[PDB]
Design an enzyme around this catalytic site. Structure first.
Site, mmCIF file in Angstrom:
data_model
loop_
_atom_site.group_PDB
_atom_site.id
_atom_site.type_symbol
_atom_site.label_atom_id
_atom_site.label_comp_id
_atom_site.label_asym_id
_atom_site.label_seq_id
_atom_site.Cartn_x
_atom_site.Cartn_y
_atom_site.Cartn_z
ATOM 1 N N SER A 1 5.764 14.357 -14.990
ATOM 2 C CA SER A 1 6.979 14.078 -15.722
ATOM 3 C C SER A 1 6.639 13.781 -17.172
ATOM 4 C CB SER A 1 7.707 12.887 -15.104
ATOM 5 O OG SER A 1 8.820 12.493 -15.889
ATOM 6 N N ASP B 1 9.679 16.751 5.112
ATOM 7 C CA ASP B 1 8.768 15.890 4.359
ATOM 8 C C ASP B 1 7.871 16.721 3.443
ATOM 9 O OD1 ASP B 1 7.183 13.904 3.415
ATOM 10 O OD2 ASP B 1 5.998 13.668 5.243
HETATM 11 C C1 LIG Z 1 1.176 1.931 0.359
HETATM 12 C C2 LIG Z 1 2.057 3.151 0.485
HETATM 13 C C3 LIG Z 1 3.421 3.027 0.683
HETATM 14 C C4 LIG Z 1 4.256 4.139 0.789
HETATM 15 C C5 LIG Z 1 5.737 3.932 1.012
HETATM 16 C C6 LIG Z 1 3.696 5.422 0.699
HETATM 17 C C7 LIG Z 1 4.579 6.640 0.850
HETATM 18 C C8 LIG Z 1 4.673 6.936 2.330
HETATM 19 N N1 LIG Z 1 5.555 8.053 2.635
HETATM 20 C C9 LIG Z 1 5.121 9.126 3.298
HETATM 21 O O1 LIG Z 1 3.947 9.293 3.627
HETATM 22 C C10 LIG Z 1 6.176 10.170 3.648
HETATM 23 N N2 LIG Z 1 5.753 11.436 2.990
HETATM 24 C C11 LIG Z 1 6.221 10.365 5.169
HETATM 25 C C12 LIG Z 1 6.482 9.114 5.953
HETATM 26 C C13 LIG Z 1 5.647 8.045 6.109
HETATM 27 N N3 LIG Z 1 6.235 7.090 6.899
HETATM 28 C C14 LIG Z 1 7.470 7.540 7.290
HETATM 29 C C15 LIG Z 1 8.429 6.933 8.099
HETATM 30 C C16 LIG Z 1 9.590 7.635 8.334
HETATM 31 C C17 LIG Z 1 9.803 8.896 7.775
HETATM 32 C C18 LIG Z 1 8.861 9.491 6.966
HETATM 33 C C19 LIG Z 1 7.662 8.814 6.718
HETATM 34 C C20 LIG Z 1 2.313 5.569 0.511
HETATM 35 C C21 LIG Z 1 1.659 6.929 0.413
HETATM 36 C C22 LIG Z 1 1.523 4.426 0.403
#
Ligand SMILES: Cc1cc(C)c(CCNC(=O)[C@@H](N)Cc2c[nH]c3ccccc23)c(C)c1
EC number: 3.4.23.22
Length: 330
Positions: free
Chosen positions: A199, A35
């Site tokens: 970008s 990650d």
């Molecule tokens: C509102 C909102 C929605 C999203 C989609 C995000 C990106 C979240 N994405 C992460 O934070 C990953 N870098 C890590 C991660 C988070 N949940 C997981 C579940 C499985 C595997 C990995 C992960 C953010 C920052 C805010």
């Protein structure tokens, strides 16, 4: 030194990628989600609340002759999507392919949120953002890459994610056979702890490239590509029947559609995401409505170049004194 490990999609939609990681002595192999959007190496463990474990492989530090409890150290992480985990901390030997770090902080989960429990294929996360984001308290810990960097032949790691197929994470070297053309490097801001870059623009399908600055993070731990609402609307406007659904939570499109490609700029270079990469399948089992892989960042606060974008490229995470990001077509 160097290391190289194969990374594999967890399901038929490439919702995430898992990479085998050896922890402890004798080795305990767990499949971790590498990650670049976070900086904690955390694992399901023998401490995890039993009802929150559902098929994951657990790390048992008591069975590792090199594990040592890091006295008084705890961790707690709240990801932006509402998922979370927390627990205690051991130092132990961690290897990714032939690359070994002794004394790595291994964050053992006592609690995980329901989304982690419900995903039996992910045994934890291996954070590869900057160590300033690490959540261990009262003494912050370093990432695996930060610990390994001085020993590496070159202070870099590379992400080569596959589309419906395995790919590769390399540490310490650039595989010059893994991409076409050249690698274009671009500046990184580390102030927020991310691999944050800008970008230079985008195109939809065969359309005219729009030069416009799009700040965002390179995040291997996020599935989709999250961009400003203007950009996302321009993309889905080219797909008959696509619409943003408040109830579903983003743009949906007819599963019978063939999607246009999406191009993003890296300096003067261009990365082309094939249209098929943007199809994430029925919104619910048996539905003829499909979820889009390009979505608005408006509710997030930052644009996120997640796996949809990164898997179209060979990506260099350059941890030299001044970090930079490199992208090549492949
Ligand atoms: C509102 C909102 C929605 C999203 C989609 C995000 C990106 C979240 N994405 C992460 O934070 C990953 N870098 C890590 C991660 C988070 N949940 C997981 C579940 C499985 C595997 C990995 C992960 C953010 C920052 C805010």
């Amino acid at each position: 030194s160097t290391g190289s490990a194969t990374t594999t999609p967890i399901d038929s939609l490439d919702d995430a990628y898992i990479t085998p990681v050896q922890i402890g002595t004798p080795a305990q192999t767990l499949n971790l989600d590498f990650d670049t959007g976070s900086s904690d190496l955390w694992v399901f463990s023998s401490e995890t609340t039993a009802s929150e474990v559902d098929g994951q492989t657990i790390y048992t530090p008591s069975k590792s002759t090199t594990a040592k409890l890091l006295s008084g150290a705890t961790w707690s992480i709240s990801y932006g999507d509402g998922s979370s985990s927390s627990g205690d901390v051991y130092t132990d030997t961690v290897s990714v392919g032939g690359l070994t770090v002794t004394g790595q902080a291994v964050e053992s989960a006592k609690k995980v949120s329901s989304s982690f429990t419900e995903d039996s294929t992910i045994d934890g996360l291996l954070g590869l953002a900057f160590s300033t984001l690490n959540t261990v308290s009262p003494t912050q810990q370093k990432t695996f890459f930060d610990n390994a960097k001085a020993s590496l032949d070159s202070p870099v790691f590379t992400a080569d994610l596959g589309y419906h197929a395995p790919g590769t994470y390399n540490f310490g070297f650039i595989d010059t056979t893994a991409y076409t053309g050249s690698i274009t490097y671009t500046a990184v801001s580390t102030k927020q702890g991310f691999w944050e870059w800008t970008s230079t623009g985008y195109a939809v399908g065969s359309g005219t490239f729009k030069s416009t600055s799009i700040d965002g993070i390179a995040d291997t731990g996020t599935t989709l590509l999250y961009l400003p609402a203007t950009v996302v609307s321009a993309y889905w406007a080219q797909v008959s029947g696509a619409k943003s659904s408040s109830s579903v939570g983003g743009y949906v499109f007819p599963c019978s559609a063939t999607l246009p490609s999406f191009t993003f700029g890296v300096g003067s270079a261009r990365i082309v995401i094939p249209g098929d990469y943007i199809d994430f399948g029925p919104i619910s089992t048996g539905s003829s409505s499909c979820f889009g892989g390009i979505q608005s960042s408006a509710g997030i606060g930052i644009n996120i170049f997640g796996d949809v974008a990164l898997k179209a490229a060979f990506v260099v995470f350059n941890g030299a004194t001044t970090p930079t990001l490199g992208f090549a077509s492949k």
